Amino acid sequence: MDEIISELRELCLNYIEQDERLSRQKLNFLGQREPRMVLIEGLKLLSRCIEIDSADKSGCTHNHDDKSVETILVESGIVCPGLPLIIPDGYKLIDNSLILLECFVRSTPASFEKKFIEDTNKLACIREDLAVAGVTLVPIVDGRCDYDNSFMPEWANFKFRDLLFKLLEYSNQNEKVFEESEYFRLCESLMDSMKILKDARSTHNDEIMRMCHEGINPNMSCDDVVFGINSLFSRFRRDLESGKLKRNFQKVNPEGLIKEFSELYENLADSDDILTLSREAVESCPLMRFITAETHGTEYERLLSMLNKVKSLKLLNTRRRQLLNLDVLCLSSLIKQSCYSSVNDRLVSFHSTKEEFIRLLRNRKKSKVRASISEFIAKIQKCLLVVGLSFEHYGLSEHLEQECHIPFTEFENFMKIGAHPIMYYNFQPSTEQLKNIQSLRRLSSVCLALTNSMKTSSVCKEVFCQVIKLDSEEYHLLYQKTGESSRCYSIQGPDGHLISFYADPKRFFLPIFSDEVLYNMIDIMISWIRSCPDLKDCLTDIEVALRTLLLLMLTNPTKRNQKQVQSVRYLVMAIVSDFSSTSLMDKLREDLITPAEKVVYKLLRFLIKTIFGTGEKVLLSAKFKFMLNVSYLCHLITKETPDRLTDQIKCFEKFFEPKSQFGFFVNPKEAITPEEECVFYEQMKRFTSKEIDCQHTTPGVNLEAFSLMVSSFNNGTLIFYEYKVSKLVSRLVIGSKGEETMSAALKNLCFYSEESPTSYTSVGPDSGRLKFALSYKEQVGGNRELYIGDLRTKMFTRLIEDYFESFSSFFSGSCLNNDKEFENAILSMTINVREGFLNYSMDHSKWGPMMCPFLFLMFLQNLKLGDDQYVRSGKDHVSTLLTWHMHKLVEVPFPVVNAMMKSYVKSKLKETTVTERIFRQYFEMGIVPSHISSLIDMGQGILHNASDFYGLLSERFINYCIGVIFGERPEAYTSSDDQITLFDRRLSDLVVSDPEEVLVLLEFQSHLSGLLNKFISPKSVAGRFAAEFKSRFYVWGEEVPLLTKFVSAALHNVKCKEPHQLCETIDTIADQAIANGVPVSLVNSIQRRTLDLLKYANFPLDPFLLNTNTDVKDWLDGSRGYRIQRLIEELCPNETKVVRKLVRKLHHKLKNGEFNEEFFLDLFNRDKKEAILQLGDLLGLEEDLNQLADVNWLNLNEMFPLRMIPSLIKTLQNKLCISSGFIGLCKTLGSRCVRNKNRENLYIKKLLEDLTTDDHVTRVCNRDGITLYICDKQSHPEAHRDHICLLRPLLWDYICISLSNSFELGVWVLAEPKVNLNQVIQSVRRLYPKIFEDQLLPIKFLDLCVLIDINSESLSLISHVVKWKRDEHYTVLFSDLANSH
Amino acid sequence: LGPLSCKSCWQKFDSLVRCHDHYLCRHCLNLLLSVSDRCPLCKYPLPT
Ligand SMILES: [Mn+2]
Ligand SMILES: [Zn+2]
Ligand SMILES: [Zn+2]
């Protein structure tokens, strides 16, 4: 009883630190006896201990007296009336800032994250008030996963907490009982199916658990199911000749399909037939392709770099004028003693001024101040001020060059300088294909529309003239708006030539260097189709058409041009196929505007008539390959979502359409009101009442076939001015959308965690009701839905999505994440296709909104799995997390509701209203929607494993219905959205013997699926010759390569990172490509493009940047190590020749009985470069200092990484827009990025000029500058500034690699031309970095390889196989395996 | 051989002639042999 109290009394003053702030509470605690008082005092003490400890540790003075924020501001004498009332744990007041500290200790990760976000928002709310008050906030939180502190040792706090724990149960025995606040105290702060919660389930989990058993008969016999099936068919087939529809499934006549395609859009696209007409119309469609095919024909240009470099520091309209006199002056001492666009003296900012607004800004800015003497007061003072940004941050040599031009000015000369040069169609030659120069002009009219987001604010002749370089002669741009939005551009040449158009820069990155890769892609393709029947003059016609198509797609990129050319895969796979949905041609028709988007259609139809025309089925494999690749040609457009709001409205619409036709119940409450119960009554009643002739697309499952499925599984037979007003009147949402989204008050931040699971009803776990929120993902064709919820709900969902995963791991048909199953699926599909049996490559439609958690609940609470205490419970946790999901609450996104309210008020104050807008009208006549909750949800990707489980079993049942009726069991597969069905021989001889019966089979397999929730899409086929399981097509035998799928992916994703990693992503994606049939000569050109990008950023090309640009198909059997070693074995051709027999000797005498630790001593990393010399002397023969000292490459991250602790350590630590990334990588990598031995910052220019010019250093290039061909022993006035310390020898970095490459991939890597846990352990085998690599956790030669990997911090060779997944099966050409080294 | 149709008509159940690795018709063979010498499919010289 009181013994624990006495123990606490003797512990507090005798084992805890005695501080003044602690003493006040300690006396009160030890002086009280009543158990409730003892507990509250002890809790307060334990709270204040952590409070003061964390406050002192952060340096923030603790708020002992509970002073408010306004109190904190006023105690220093500052009056700030009006601020939210908060009590930070610690506070630091300085002259012009404020620091507020919040601390809290949580055990469960979920509540910890919730408290973290809550406190961050609470601190950030008053940011603007602090800013306008003249101060600023320093954000800081203290989230500690323990109660350790200065004032108490570990054992003291442990025993103290345990004593309060025991006293808490002792009090709980007495009348001190607390309902669930006791639970928060005791069980919180002291996964895998927490059953510790109570059970408040009553009179609602009886309706829900009753509808799942009313009507179903889940135990029918093994021959009362056959007699059930044979009375479900033949009650369909007898109602097919007059009743419902002819199966949606019709045979294919290829000519019929082609004519039906040709007759599409019988409005305006009307059969423009001849080629020459089509090309003549193409070469005039947009305004751009009307230039791209047109057949036309440094003292300055560096003063600008200086005048521009000192501009980012300041920006003012009173400036930028005398910043332009400095430039107009220079354009009077270079033509007078002798570009310029006619009114322009190109100013600093890519700006373009007029030579008459200058030379008139002065003479008022000057007359305001002896006019001739009035100059050289600002034309010299300005020079001195600009040179004031001198060697400050290394003001380079450009300072004395201008001291000659600028003072060379006068007023007898400045009264006519702009008065001297006072001079203020090309048609579409259409012969120009098979000509590089017509794409080699897009590749430079984009690089001058792309550089163009890289302008700045800069607040007629105000037009941001970029420059279009090209061979010699150059033409401009002219526009008026910067940033990344749209603007109306121009072009200028020597004549005017206003070729206006309207584009967006972000869409135009693909052709930025790529003139020899596109023109070779579209030249490989036409080497597939040297098909006989075409040898007549159609090959040139096809080539011109295909070229004029790629030009149109690149020049006029837009969403319609993507969806269109994407759809041409289904049509071709139907022309080669053998059955096809009747409603196909409504799945190809878009709406077309913008005559480019029509000529694309005309080209497509012409191409299809030409290839798939007469004489067909003589080479059909090659034409199929050609055309599927032309279908994938749609990746050349970027996937970057045209608009934001007009692509959020669309995703909400695609969510909310089916709910319109089923039921929705806007904005439920936290406690399910009777109306919600009534609406769920009605929906669960409609869901399970779908008669045997259904409306064929509506959600429902029929309780007469469903009974058969479940009862056949339980039984053992199936196993093994206007703007402002019109916006303020639409600012009424504030008047409508509320729809809202004693306890130890102080100690809430303390030990006691406020929110946590307790008694859980059937609706929600008592913390909330599984809230969510939706946003769109980004894809090529259409934007997929995405559901994202807070972390606690993301933790509950994992239990269901894991239980079902393991449960379906027992059954062997699904392939979603069972990767090993995919290989078997591929093997079986290939064996099938090789022979000619049908493949009903189906693809289900509306798999998101037509599946409901109610359905999995029905399917689970009816199965009869095994014994109790492990199965009888457990499933009573999935079957009560699913009930939670059934009542989820997605949230109508704020932009969408704002837009709908705006539209409503506009229309009402002042039709074509879509369905999901009339509902907004109904409700905004009353209350605005904010949350939608309905049965048919299956958040797309949330339960993407439960859905796979259900799909797998349903497909295992329907392929039994078909087996018992027709006589054959066809196997199947699944991914949770796609499928396949490989009918066997007996049902494939029938398609040639009788098609009218296999038509019924495909009519019925799509009718049962209707009687369940599975609706087959019109895009399915059944072909005796292709396949498409998860986008891996097949022809008879081999597989369609999809070249254009991988080229379009390598060319994108040049992400803003350190270039030594940007050039690692690409060296992965290139092996990804060569896995399939992208020929090697194209991969080289992709790599050359990437290097040209970097070289345009002005980044020195050190020999480890990007792989060899001379490759054998040797991307087999080589890691990233072999590419780089084969590079450095060609960059220094004959030095490498000894350092590759020294390594042979080293490997000879390291593996059996020598080295293994003393190699590390000779690795000598402790000191400087004579290790190569001593190691050559150790076991070899003459090796001069020439190999060692001479070859040396400049290395930017030699001492510290370059800004924006080894590598493999960071990677293991990592196991616990795209055209606005480049426009930034070209900005950081030019400024102060490299770092010195003292945390200093330099430029790459000041450092890359001295290493070649201002020393006895020889630096000539071989396409990549291997600077300082000597650095003789680095015997030198070393460490000049950095350019000598910062460059490491080459022929050593070759040794460590050409050894690491020799245990990892073989011994041949020297002759004359596994996983995370392991790596952590053999990093542990030297324990110095473990102090940093351990606390973040909450074989034969591997030691050598990991050791050589740690030092070489640029390069992979172990940390590769544990960072990027390689591939297993390669298909490679046979004209690349003959040219091998 | 393996399957039973022109590896290139993708049709024509059975009347074809044997290549080195696939089947080809009377036809099929004419319209290829009139353009080139190799079997553009099996990378071998066509039959005669
Ligand atoms: Mn599919
Ligand atoms: Zn044939
Ligand atoms: Zn052949």
Residue numbers in the entry:
A (entry chain A): 1 to 190, 200 to 306, 315 to 355, 370 to 400, 411 to 465, 472 to 506, 524 to 784, 857 to 877, ...
B (entry chain B): 27 to 74
Please quote the authors directly.
Lymphocytic choriomeningitis virus (LCMV) is the prototypic member of the Arenaviridae family and belongs to the Old World (OW) arenavirus together with Lassa virus (LASV), which are distinct from the New World (NW) arenavirus [e.g. Machupo virus (MACV) and Junin virus (JUNV)]. As a segmented negative-sense single-stranded RNA virus (sNSRV), arenavirus encodes a large polymerase (L) to form a ribonucleoprotein complex (RNP) together with the genomic-length RNA encapsidated by viral nucleoprotein (NP) and facilitate virus replication and transcription. Arenavirus also encodes a RING finger Z matrix protein as a regulator of RNA synthesis. Previous studies have shown that the arenavirus Z protein forms a species-specific complex with the L protein and inhibits RNA synthesis initiation by impairing the catalytic activity of the L protein, which is known to be essential for the balance of infection and further initiation of virion assembly; however, the mechanism remains unclear.
The position of Z partially blocks the product exit tunnel for the releasing nascent RNA product. Although the full-length Z was used to generate the L–Z complex, only its zinc finger domain can be built in the complex structure, suggesting that its N-/C-terminal portions are flexible and do not participate in the interaction with L. The zinc finger domain of LCMV-Z contains a single α-helix and two β-strands and harbors two zinc ions by residues C32–C35–C51–C54 and C45–H48–C65–C68 to form two zinc fingers, which are conserved with that observed in LASV-Z. The LCMV L–Z interaction comprises a set of hydrophobic interactions, hydrogen bonds, and van de Waals interactions with a large intermolecular contact surface of ~780 Å2, which is 20% of the ~4,000 Å2 total area of the molecular face of Z. The interacting residues of Z are located on the surface at the side of the two zinc-binding sites, including P29, S34, C35, W36, Q37, C54, L57, L58, V61, P66 and L67. With the binding of Z, only one α-helix can be observed, and most parts of the α-ribbon motif lack interpretable cryo-EM density, suggesting that these parts have a flexible architecture. Moreover, an additional conformational change of an α-helix in the palm subdomain can be observed in the LCMV L–Z complex.
